[PDB]
Subunit: 227 residues, 3 copies
């Protein structure tokens, strides 16, 4: 406890945790080699989100950064979580659409830069600089979203209707959800202090649980994952 | 020198080093594309263990963590070593058994969580919390071992007898050896101080050399690695 | 500004940045699945070099290390950059030559050790030790270069002449360029202070831009990347 946002963290820890248990149980005895990958990728996302949120609740994933003439509390664990989970979500989309290795590598590369560059931004002591990294990170994201919206859709159009429509849903959700992140970051205590850490944490929480549990639900409950 | 455990560290450095030289020399001119992978994975394990142990001997891989109302010496390099070496050992087992990519990804994912979560546990300042991470890490391990014992055996049963029996041996050794780690950690200066750092280091040393040099010996000296 | 080497850093940031824009634009609408990988790998190298150089210019990728009875400025970001970019360059060479997965894994493994071990060397407080890690790192490099010069050439000899000769060029450039790194490091402020940080930074700059932009140019402007 202590920190006023501890509650959104513990709630997030709980949801990632149960979300994992459920996906695990649901994938129990699934032999389809293709479904397995989908289950392994999707189940690993919340499992990681769980460990990271718990680190924020317990205090480990929290550090202090001086900028703006003050010591600001920065949750680095969010980045460590995203670093490993965004690529997996990208893999799910790639497997569903049967993307070229070349484009998978670019997206993954684009993603690592986005999170890494975003983490650098969060830990920068010169207020003004935080926004530069936020722009480099956001540009990287637009590149990923641009390719997922156009390139992948075109790819999904060659799969059977169940796959095509499930991808469309997953596609619309990732574009909307992902674009919300740089916004919250910009208005939260890491960029402009237009919003308090308390709210900043609640937003990322809902944004995080939707992207990892919801996304998993949408995909795993469709037949789209079966060869 | 200095630290009373320097000797187990230097001895470990020596053994990882010679273990690498030997595996390297032994793999010299091997054309079998399958044997090569086995040699590349197995030879890389001690090569990494070498660099990490040397970092502990020289002092770099040693840090201090306050918990229990004291500054405890923590060898983080052990974790950095394990982070990269456990996945490789898992790859060896997977290649021997011809595991599904989906299960390879889950194990690797399970493994990163195990070591990462274990490293977080080692660096936590709130004594009580160290044990929580130890449980999350140990649960992750049981998942890996459960899948390697049942899932893989079943897989090996479809390979020729040389492969089947070599896997059985490797399987029995990893289960026994791996389960020893969380125990040493629990009774060592990182959990309950039932045992001194001096002994704690000697145990991990023997546990480490057996798992990386011994395991490599067992596998590399069998015909099991040949297509 | 401030640091006397800021200029070589900003110039490097600019060149990596433009080098990326150009490779991106050049790869615009390329359908050849093989060419795409080549473009994705090659374009990602400078994109990462860009983010890292910018971190050095802005000051983030700069830290201070005490050794020799003084606080020496150490640019860790160089290592973080190399950690991700050398493996990619290795992948390009591997794809051009169609290397065995086993050898790809060994080189990548050899490379991570080289950079990691080199980073450890840069951050070591005991002057004398810095040179030990420099030797372990350099040995790792010789292993990579030895395999790229002999093993790969032999491999390229089985491809069509355009591929064979482009590889020869790329091969000669990586051997010469890569061997220059441990030298600059040895004579620069990180090893023997025979050369000032100012020059040390200018050399790595030219060495870096040549290896990432030049290399990319040579490869991407040849037909060698087409199946
Ligand atoms: C697997 C996955 C896909 C990839 C994951 C990336 C991961 C593996 C690696 C990163 C690389 C690593 C090997 C390099 C680490 C070296 C290590 C020694 C340095 C670590 O520090 C870097 C951290 C920053 O730490 C900072 O935050 C903490 C917590 O808040 C602080 O405690 C710490 O001090 C901070 O350090 C920064 O500030 C220091 C400031 O010190 C002093 O501070 C005072 C005021 O307090 C004054 O300002 C002083 O100034 S003065 O008075 O002296 O003048 C000032 O000195 C600095 O000294 C430090 O240097 C530092 O700025 O951040 C890590 C950031 C990220 C992870 C790195 C960049 C990653 C890049 C974007 C990745 C692209 C990867 C992509 C995935 C490619 C995939 C390719 C495939 C193969 C295809
Ligand atoms: C490639 C491989 C498979 C993956 C490898 C993972 C690797 C790449 C990445 C980790 C991610 C990275 C990008 C984020 C780094 C950000 C960086 C700025 C922070 C680094 O710190 C994190 C370290 C902890 O450092 C701590 O230990 C050192 C050494 O002992 C200390 O010097 C340092 O200070 C410590 O920092 C902790 O404590 C700080 C405390 O500061 C103050 O301390 C005082 C007392 O001393 C008081 O307690 C103060 O309190 S108060 O008074 O102010 O109130 C207190 O503030 C904190 O401030 C710090 O925040 C911190 O708690 O640990 C890193 C841990 C691990 C590596 C991260 C979690 C990883 C997760 C389990 C990985 C799953 C990966 C799996 C492999 C997925 C694979 C997916 C595939 C694609 C399929
Ligand atoms: C994805 C890619 C391919 C792989 C990338 C590797 C990356 C993911 C992971 C590294 C692993 C990580 C999980 C472990 C991190 C734990 C963390 C808590 C520790 C981090 O510290 C390690 C840093 C060093 O930080 C140091 O530099 C900064 C900046 O300058 C300092 O601020 C910091 O303090 C430094 O810490 C060192 O010094 C400390 C000293 O403290 C005190 O200092 C005073 C003087 O100032 C006195 O000397 C004190 O002495 S005394 O008085 O008390 O007696 C002294 O205590 C120490 O306490 C610290 O312990 C430390 O020495 O470095 C990270 C180095 C590298 C990245 C790790 C080794 C990596 C290895 C070679 C990798 C092989 C990988 C290969 C790629 C395999 C691929 C396999 C495939 C699956 C096939
Ligand atoms: C954990 C699940 C998901 C879907 C995480 C997504 C995170 C992002 C898209 C983060 C993007 C960032 C940008 C674009 C710039 C500001 C820094 C961020 C890392 C928050
Ligand atoms: C380097 C070679 C091997 C086989 C290393 C294995 C390490 C483990 C199985 C470590 C497990 C841990 C657990 C289960 C919980 C406590 C923290 C540890 C990381 C020690
Ligand atoms: C970013 C582009 C390239 C080609 C980087 C190459 C870097 C090296 C070959 C670095 C080698 C090192 C050695 C051999 C020993 C000293 C420490 C270094 C990391 C500089
Ligand atoms: C704390 C560790 C959490 C690890 C989570 C791993 C995600 C595992 S998904 C699981 O993977 C199996 C392969 O092993 C498939 O056969 C199953 O169908 C699938 O559901
Ligand atoms: C310090 C750097 C240590 C690097 C260790 C790399 C392990 C290399 S194993 C070696 O890989 C070759 C492919 O290159 C195979 O052809 C050989 O049969 C096999 O034995
Ligand atoms: C800041 C983020 C920078 C990201 C850089 C990614 C490198 C992308 S190369 C690009 O990849 C496409 C697949 O997506 C191929 O179809 C194109 O032919 C090729 O040119």
């Amino acid at each position: 406890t202590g920190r006023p946002e501890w509650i959104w963290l513990a709630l997030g820890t709980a949801l990632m945790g149960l979300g994992t248990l459920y996906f695990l149980v649901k994938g129990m005895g699934v032999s389809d080699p293709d479904a397995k990958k989908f289950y392994a990728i999707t189940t690993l996302v919340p499992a990681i989100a769980f460990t990271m949120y718990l680190s924020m609740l317990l205090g480990y994933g929290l550090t202090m950064v001086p900028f703006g003439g003050e010591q600001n509390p920065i949750y680095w664990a969010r980045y460590a979580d995203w670093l490993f989970t965004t690529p997996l979500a990208l893999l799910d989309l790639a497997l569903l659409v049967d993307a070229d290795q070349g484009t998978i590598l670019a997206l993954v590369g684009a993603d690592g830069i986005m999170i890494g560059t975003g983490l650098v931004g969060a830990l920068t002591k010169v207020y003004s600089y935080r926004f530069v990294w936020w722009a480099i990170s956001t540009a990287a994201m637009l590149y990923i979203l641009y390719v997922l919206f156009f390139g992948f859709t075109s790819k999904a159009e060659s799969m059977r209707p169940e796959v095509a429509s499930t991808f469309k849903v997953l596609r619309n959700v990732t574009v909307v959800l992902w674009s919300a992140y740089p916004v919250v970051w910009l208005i939260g205590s890491e960029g402009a202090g237009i919003v308090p850490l308390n709210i900043e944490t609640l937003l990322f929480m809902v944004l995080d649980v939707s992207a990892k549990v919801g996304f998993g639900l949408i995909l795993l409950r469709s037949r789209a994952i079966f060869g």
